Amino acid sequence: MAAPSMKERQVCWGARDEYWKCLDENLEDASQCKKLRSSFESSCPQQWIKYFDKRRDYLKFKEKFEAGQFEPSETTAKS
Numbered sequence: 001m002a003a004p005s006m007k008e009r010q011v012c013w014g015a016r017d018e019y020w021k022c023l024d025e026n027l028e029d030a031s032q033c034k035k036l037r038s039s040f041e042s043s044c045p046q047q048w049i050k051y052f053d054k055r056r057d058y059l060k061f062k063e064k065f066e067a068g069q070f071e072p073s074e075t076t077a078k079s
Contacts, residue, residue, distance in 0.1 A: 008046035015040030023059040
């Protein structure tokens, strides 16, 4: 498991709460909540949560919360 020093208040707690109602923000589109909640429940740190989430982000960014709203890019010859 990974335990960074930068942890988020809303994102981490929200993920845990979203387990009950996904996309607790507005629930405007619960259809995409499955994927988005998956990003959130992945761990806890917003860094990776939003990193993967921002790709399919529907409700989270709909709340006018914008953080790196970019599509997946190319990957190099990584490990």
